[PDB]
Amino acid sequence: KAVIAIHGGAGAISRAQMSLQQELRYIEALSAIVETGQKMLEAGESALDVVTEAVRLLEECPLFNAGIGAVFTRDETHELDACVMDGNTLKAGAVAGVSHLRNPVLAARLVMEQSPHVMMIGEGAENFAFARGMERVSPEIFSTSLRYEQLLAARK
Amino acid sequence: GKAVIAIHGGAGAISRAQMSLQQELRYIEALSAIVETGQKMLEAGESALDVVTEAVRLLEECPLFNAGIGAVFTRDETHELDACVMDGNTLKAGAVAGVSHLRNPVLAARLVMEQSPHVMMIGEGAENFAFARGMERVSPEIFSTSLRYEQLLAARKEG
Amino acid sequence: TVGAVALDLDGNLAAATSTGGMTNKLPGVVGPWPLVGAGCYANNASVAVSCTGTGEVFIRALAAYDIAALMDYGGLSLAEACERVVMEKLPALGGSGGLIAIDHEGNVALPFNTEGMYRAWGYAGDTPTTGIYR
Amino acid sequence: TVGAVALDLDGNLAAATSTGGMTNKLPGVVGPWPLVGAGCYANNASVAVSCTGTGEVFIRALAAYDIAALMDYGGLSLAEACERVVMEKLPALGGSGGLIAIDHEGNVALPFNTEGMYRAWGYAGDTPTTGIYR
Ligand SMILES: [Cl-]
Ligand SMILES: [Cl-]
Ligand SMILES: [Cl-]
Ligand SMILES: [Cl-]
Ligand SMILES: [Cl-]
Ligand code: NA
Ligand code: NA
């Protein structure tokens, strides 16, 4: 009975303001990610590795507000957060307020596996990750036109 | 109904062998004074929320306790402070983490609770929000005490 | 916000969440997403949960752990615990959003009280299900 | 870490916690103290809790909310919920610490599994009690 569920965010999604082709881009992205998780589960991969990979793919996909495609703050910056929890060991890892880590869920897993801590924040979280070989990315690699236009509209 | 306060100043490895009665009495006297202030405020009809805020503010101000003045030192000889407060009536909460320039973190947490639509803020963003609401900027040096610096030194090597 | 929950062939549960927060957010705000028990929780005894929506309300309500505790201590089904948290408790605090959850028996729930939630799920060896709207 | 819980004449519960963390801590670590449900929780339906001790375990076990949920959903008394969390569940995960708690009926509990916990309590109009050791 192995199973995966994913989400890409809850909120005001308006169908009047949507075309079917626009919707299908989201459906296709979700379907591809769930299929990757299903195949990993069928292959005997761990639940922890499956949720990590699914969230890494949602981060990579610019359609979803995580990683690449992150929304903008009041200051036109990105501040990213992630968590991961293993139901077997009850171990967890989390980062908040990081701007220089491409894949926050991977940094969260690094906190869980390579420290005794659950949660790290900001530059201290980044420095923990960098000291362990995780790459420092330009803070601007997350930026997209669509999310910048939504920022402009939020202000108005 | 019967109003009541409890406080704590931390759980861990306290041994009698390590302590003098005068050392113990400093802690007892501080705890007694703070709980008595809380009791008096409750008796006078002050809210539970104001009472726990004031008690924790006093425990912060007390250098004997690891919060506010008397905060432990990090690996980098810095102070990083955190606090939370929650109101059981409204289920509102406020919290700050990783703040170094706010004298009384619990007051910053109460400011997040009462003066924002948020529950938690961290670091410089938290400090900037607090300063925008008129809270005073302090140097993190104000938290430093000889006792806690000596505990950092005893836990490490010099170089 | 994005998230995933899974039950593997060895009966293990896990959860993950990642986000950029909210458009135009005040710098330094932390929502429930990186908070264990608020945005994310997993326990083989009960459930794996990942949340999305009004951040402050999911923290105040400890929404992800509340699903677990309603099942474990309250005896609620996954569906009843999800209905209680998402359709009753979150709106009572002024909150909007949803979550995904899988229990240790492989029941799945994707409740939300918003106009939409980008979501998908599927059992291993089966065709996935996708959705956006209600 | 320090903390306070109270029940007022109007029947309202509140909790607060403040800390400097651990001597020699790695900068950027957040323990359970600022986190609703881990280090601090209050709900007039159940309990007010402030915690102190092994940071990582109080988060993983959501200790403060777990007291509340054990009482509200499990029907445990304050004393039973405190014993369950502090003397059974937290040690099972390798956690050391304690907490203070007052329930909506005015019962008070100051459980700890450590050698000591600096603590005090008192009813409005009564003499205070203080402690360090067991
Ligand atoms: Cl909506
Ligand atoms: Cl399916
Ligand atoms: Cl749909
Ligand atoms: Cl001890
Ligand atoms: Cl004693
Ligand atoms: Na993305
Ligand atoms: Na102090």
Given a contact cutoff of 8 angstroms between Cβ atoms, the answer to whether D65 and C58 are in contact is: no
CA–CA min distance C25, chain B (Å): 10
Identify how many contiguous H helices and E strands chain C contains and give both numbers: 4, 9
Q: Which residues of D touch A128 (CB under 8 A)?
A: 26, 28
Helix (H, G, I), strand (E, B) or coil at A86: strand
Please name the amino acid found at residue B149: Y
Structure tokens at C81: 């615990």
B120-122 and B93-99 strand pairing: parallel
Contact A128 D59 (CB under 8 A): no
- In which region does residue C46 sit, left (phi positive, over 0), alpha (psi from -120 to 50) or beta (all else)? alpha
| Alpha-carbon span C54 to C59, nearest angstrom | 9
DSSP string, C61-107: TTHHHHHHHHHHTT---HHHHHIIIIIIIHHHTT--EEEEEEETT--
A92-98 and A119-121 strand pairing: parallel
Backbone angles phi, psi at A45, to 5 degrees: -70, 150
Interface membership of D20 toward A (CB under 8 Å): no
Closest C-alpha to C132, from C103, C110, C105: C110
DSSP B72: P
CA–CA min distance A99, chain B (Å): 14
Distances (CA, A) of C6 to C36, C69, C86, C129: 17, 19, 20, 15
Interface membership of D91 toward B (CB under 8 Å): no
| Alpha-carbon span C30 to C39, nearest angstrom | 11
Residue C48 placed within a domain: yes
Closest C-alpha to D17, from A14, B82, B31: B82
Closest C-alpha to C3, from C21, C20, C15: C15
Given a contact cutoff of 8 angstroms between Cβ atoms, the answer to whether D78 and D104 are in contact is: no
Contact C34 A81 (CB under 8 A): yes
Residue C25 placed within a domain: no
CA–CA min distance B125, chain A (Å): 10
CA-based radius of gyration for chain B: 17
What long-range pairs does A136-141 form, CB within 8 A, spacing at least 24?
A136/A100, A136/A101, A137/A100, A137/A101, A137/A102, A138/A100, A139/A77, A139/A78, A139/A99, A139/A100, A141/A68, A141/A102
What stretches of chain B show up as alpha helix (H) in DSSP?
A: 21-43, 48-61, 105-115, 123-132, 146-154
Given a contact cutoff of 8 angstroms between Cβ atoms, the answer to whether C59 and D59 are in contact is: no
Given a contact cutoff of 8 angstroms between Cβ atoms, the answer to whether C118 and A30 are in contact is: yes
| Alpha-carbon span A42 to A38, nearest angstrom | 6
| Alpha-carbon span B83 to B95, nearest angstrom | 5
Given a contact cutoff of 8 angstroms between Cβ atoms, the answer to whether C54 and C96 are in contact is: yes
Q: Count of A–B CB contacts within 8 Å?
A: 12
D59 CA to middle of ligand 1, Å?
31
Q: Chain D residue with minimal CA distance to B83?
A: D18
Show Cβ contacts of residue B29 under 8 Å, excluding neighbours closer than 6 positions.
Answer: none
Contact C4 A11 (CB under 8 A): no
D107 CA to middle of ligand 7, Å?
27
Consecutive H or E run containing A35:
helix A20-42
Q: Chain D residue with minimal CA distance to A112?
A: D56
Interface membership of B119 toward A (CB under 8 Å): no
DSSP string, D19-80: E---TTBPTTEE-SSSSBTTTEEE-TTSEEEEEEE-HHHHHHTTHHHHHHHHHHTT---HHH
Interface membership of D75 toward A (CB under 8 Å): no
Consecutive H or E run containing B10:
strand B4-12
Structure tokens at D22: 């651990």
Residue D24 placed within a domain: no
How many CB atoms sit inside 10 A of residue C17's CB? 39
Using CB atoms, list chains with 3+ pairs below 8 Å to chain D. A, B, C
How many CB atoms sit inside 10 A of residue A88's CB? 17
Size (chain B), residues: 159
Smallest Cβ distance to D60: which of A90, A115, A127? A90
User: Residue C9 maps to which CATH number?
Assistant: 3.60.20.30
Residue D42 placed within a domain: yes
| Alpha-carbon span C32 to C47, nearest angstrom | 18
Residue pointed to by tokens 């991977």: A106
Contact B32 D114 (CB under 8 A): no
Consecutive H or E run containing A51:
helix A47-60
Smallest Cβ distance to B119: which of C26, C27, C56? C56
Given a contact cutoff of 8 angstroms between Cβ atoms, the answer to whether A32 and A40 are in contact is: no
Domain range holding C49? Answer: 2-18+30-123+129-133
Backbone angles phi, psi at C122, to 5 degrees: -175, 145
Interface membership of C28 toward B (CB under 8 Å): yes
Contact B48 D123 (CB under 8 A): no
Closest C-alpha to D71, from D61, D83, D59: D83
Closest C-alpha to D123, from D9, D34, D37: D9
Residue C23 placed within a domain: no
Active site residue D19: no
| Alpha-carbon span D134 to D129, nearest angstrom | 14
Interface membership of A124 toward B (CB under 8 Å): yes
Distances (CA, A) of D83 to B134, D98, D109: 43, 10, 10
Given a contact cutoff of 8 angstroms between Cβ atoms, the answer to whether C58 and C39 are in contact is: yes
For residue A11, the cross-strand partners are C116
Closest C-alpha to A37, from A52, A59, A24: A52
Show Cβ contacts of residue A22 under 8 Å, excluding neighbours closer than 6 positions.
Answer: none
Q: Which structural technique was applied?
A: X-ray
C133 CA to middle of ligand 1, Å?
10
DSSP D87: I
Given a contact cutoff of 8 angstroms between Cβ atoms, the answer to whether A122 and A97 are in contact is: yes
Q: How many domains does chain C have?
A: 1
Distances (CA, A) of A94 to B109, C71, D59: 21, 25, 11
CA-based radius of gyration for chain D: 14
Using CB atoms, list chains with 3+ pairs below 8 Å to chain B. A, C, D
Q: Compute the CA torsion angle C46, C49, C54, C57 (nearest 10 deg).
A: 20
Smallest Cβ distance to A10: which of C7, C40, C98? C98
Largest CA distance in chain B: 59
